[PDB]
A paper describes a structure:
[name] mediates inflammatory signaling by the bacteria‐sensing receptors NOD1 and [name]. Here, we reveal that [name] kinase activity is dispensable for [name] inflammatory signaling and show that [name] inhibitors function instead by antagonizing XIAP‐binding and XIAP‐mediated ubiquitination of [name]. We map the XIAP binding site on [name] to the loop between β2 and β3 of the N‐lobe of the kinase, which is in close proximity to the ATP‐binding pocket. Here, we reveal that [name] kinase activity is dispensable for [name] inflammatory signaling, show that [name] inhibitors function instead by antagonizing XIAP‐binding and XIAP‐mediated ubiquitination of [name], and identify structural features of [name] required for XIAP binding and for the design of efficient small molecule inhibitors of NOD1/2‐[name]‐dependent signaling.
To further understand the structural contributions of R1‐R3, we crystallized [name] in complex with [name], containing a hydrogen (H) in the R1 position compared to fluorine (F) and methoxy (OMe) in CSLP37 and 43, respectively. Overall, the complex with [name] revealed [name] in an inactive conformation previously shown for Type I1/2A inhibitors (Wu et al, 2015; Roskoski, 2016). Specifically, when compared to structures of active [name] in complex with the ATP analog AMP‐PNP, the [name]‐[name] structure showed mis‐orientation of the catalytic residues Asp146 of the HHD motif and Asp164 of the DFG motif, a slight misalignment of the R‐spine, a shifted P‐loop, and a completely disordered activation segment (AS) which is partially structured in active [name]. The structure is refined at 3.2 Å resolution, and the electron density map is of sufficient quality in the region of the inhibitor to place the inhibitor and its relevant functional groups with reasonably good precision. [name] forms two hydrogen bonds to the backbone of the hinge segment residues Glu96 and Met98, and the R3 sulfonamide forms a hydrogen bond to Asn151. The R3 hydrogen bond helps position the phenyl ring and R2 OMe group, which inserts into a sub‐pocket formed by the side chains of Glu66 and Leu70 of the αC‐helix. However, the R1 position does not optimally fill the hydrophobic pocket (termed deep pocket) formed by the side chains of Ala45, Lys47, Ile93, and gatekeeper Thr95 located on the β3 and β5 strands of the β sheet bundle. This is further revealed by the molecular docking of CSLP37 (R1 = F) and CSLP43 (R1 = OMe), which demonstrates that the larger R1 groups of these molecules more optimally fill the deep pocket (and EV2F). The [name]‐[name] complex structure revealed the inhibitor occupying the ATP pocket of [name] with the R1‐R3 groups of the inhibitor inserted into the deep pocket behind the adenine‐binding site. In sum, these data suggested that occupancy of the deep pocket is essential for the ability of CSLP analogs to bind endogenous [name] and to block signaling by interfering with XIAP binding.
Numbering used by the authors:
A (entry chain A): 5 to 49, 53 to 167, 188 to 200, 207 to 315
B (entry chain B): 5 to 50, 55 to 165, 188 to 316
The structure:
């Protein structure tokens, strides 16, 4: 009964555009609003076909209808004959991929921060699932997860390399789908390692996973230093099971994770974040 | 063209309710969601149809003003047994507590105070630049909640200090004015740079109303506002122009944001987190 219309931001109110990152889904730039006096990110894509506009609008309204504390907050759409793009909050620290694999800038990443990030990811995906109707991500990657000033998760890219996160039952030309990806991410988050490093052709990855093989679980990929190691390992291995029905919903995962995050003090999170900024500063 | 329906949260999905604080605008409790697995705050009642209509008005105003510094509403609980607004849980409470709880919060680094002022101005300016412009007309340190990282979140669109004189007799038809809000902001800025109660010496609020209608404002001196305050002169000019006897002399929030940006720009990004962690540590162990 209570509807809210996504504001249409005029293009000429967006100053200081700068290419932030290009990718398959389009190009993302940074800008600042003339009236709101705040920084924002803009995702855009020749003239515009009607299908392209329809897909961009689908994505924008999906962001608008799934507003949650850990879902990328959309601010408005810029829809003009000259330009068309989605406006959202600017996430300075970029994607989780950079955080994980930029060991020069990010030498250490305290376990409290890693687990808080995992928890917020699960929370975002679970809220998307608990919508009506249930909203399916169908494409979770360490590149979709953006991190704000305090390294809090913000998920993006919900609507219609990238093979690491695909369940085996999709090779043959669902809710469980998403959890699979999540499991993988957890692995890639506790190890800071590329899944299937030794494999050079992605079809090798597809073959190994279709044979029921997953990334290595050993002493090197996951050190014993990792907190709550055994629970995380059980969660991961059951979360990427060959059979979809055996994979748990995100609510079971949240119930399993909450006591894990509960062992970290509130201040240790900020300590890890500020230590990360300091190691990156020096 | 893009509509978004506020989810209707069932009452039975709110577990572990606890009276957090009662007040004029109603009572706010804390609770936890069964499916979303997150903590939330719930504003509830003490029901006529007029009350329900007003609650729906508040809910739709919060939902239509979704902004980074506006209290994020999650859903509405509309059942015959209960009716309430559900929003994000702001653990550290309101700005008033931060300012005047010197036991838990002995020191408050200037970077964080300026971040809070900046975010307040940003939220109010966003409210003004809407279509149509939405007026707060009741800004106080109790409306400003503080999230996990002490980021400002405005809500709710001895409490007269933040009301301009032309609003005491509410000329609603005549002077439901834009400048009103800026007045409030000025006062808060003072109370944020001094950590002191405006009109401390006055004990009767009607005396405060008379004095303010007489063109009197809080004192600006060496004690209320020490010279230690960063950018002291610029902030003092902002305050004095924000509570001018004449409403038209008070600037829009866009002018204030344009003046504040260069001030916030002088603090490095890490100093904010350092001040916040210092606040969290001083509040602990006490
Ligand atoms: C294909 C669309 C990307 S996305 O799939 O992740 N989604 C999506 C994302 C964003 C967004 C992105 C970023 C960002 C900034 C810097 C960097 N790095 C440093 C500079 N060089 C490259 C690496 C990485 C990411 C910040 N803030 C945002 N708000 C904005 C809108 C979006 O709309 C779906
Ligand atoms: C009480 C003012 C109402 S309000 O004017 O600020 N508006 C409004 C606010 C809220 C809200 C409030 C709180 C909150 C938490 C701790 C405390 N303290 C601790 C115990 N001692 C007293 C002080 C006070 C408030 C947290 N999170 C929320 N989300 C929820 C809905 C609202 O309705 C729009």
């Amino acid at each position: 009964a209570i509807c809210s219309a996504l504001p249409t931001i005029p293009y000429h109110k967006l100053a200081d555009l700068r290419y932030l990152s290009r990718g398959a889904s389009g190009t993302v730039s940074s800008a600042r609003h003339a009236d709101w006096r705040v920084q924002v990110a803009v995702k855009h894509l020749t003239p515009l076909l009607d299908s392209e506009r329809k897909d961009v609008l689908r994505e924008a309204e999906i962001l608008h209808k799934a507003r949650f504390s850990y879902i990328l907050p959309i601010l408005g759409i810029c829809n003009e004959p000259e330009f068309l793009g989605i406006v959202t909050e600017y996430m300075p620290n970029g994607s989780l991929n950079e955080l994980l694999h930029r060991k020069t800038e990010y030498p250490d990443v305290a376990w409290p921060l890693r687990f808080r990030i995992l928890h917020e990811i699960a929370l975002g995906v679970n809220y998307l699932h608990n919508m009506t109707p249930p909203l399916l991500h169908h494409d979770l990657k360490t590149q979709n997860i953006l991190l704000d000033n305090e390294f809090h998760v913000k998920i993006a890219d919900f609507g219609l390399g990238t093979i690491i996160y695909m369940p085996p039952e999709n090779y043959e030309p669902s809710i469980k789908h998403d959890i699979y990806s999540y499991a993988v991410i957890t692995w890639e988050v506790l190890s800071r390692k590329q899944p299937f490093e030794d494999v050079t052709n992605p079809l090798q990855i597809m073959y190994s996973v279709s044979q029921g093989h997953r990334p290595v679980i050993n002493e090197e990929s996951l050190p014993y230093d990792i907190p709550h190691r055994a629970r995380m390992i059980s969660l991961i291995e059951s979360g990427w099971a060959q059979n979809p029905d055996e994979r748990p919903s995100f609510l079971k995962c949240l119930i399993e994770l909450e006591p894990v995050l509960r062992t970290f003090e509130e201040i240790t999170f900020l300590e890890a974040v500020i230590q990360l900024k300091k190691t990156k500063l020096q």
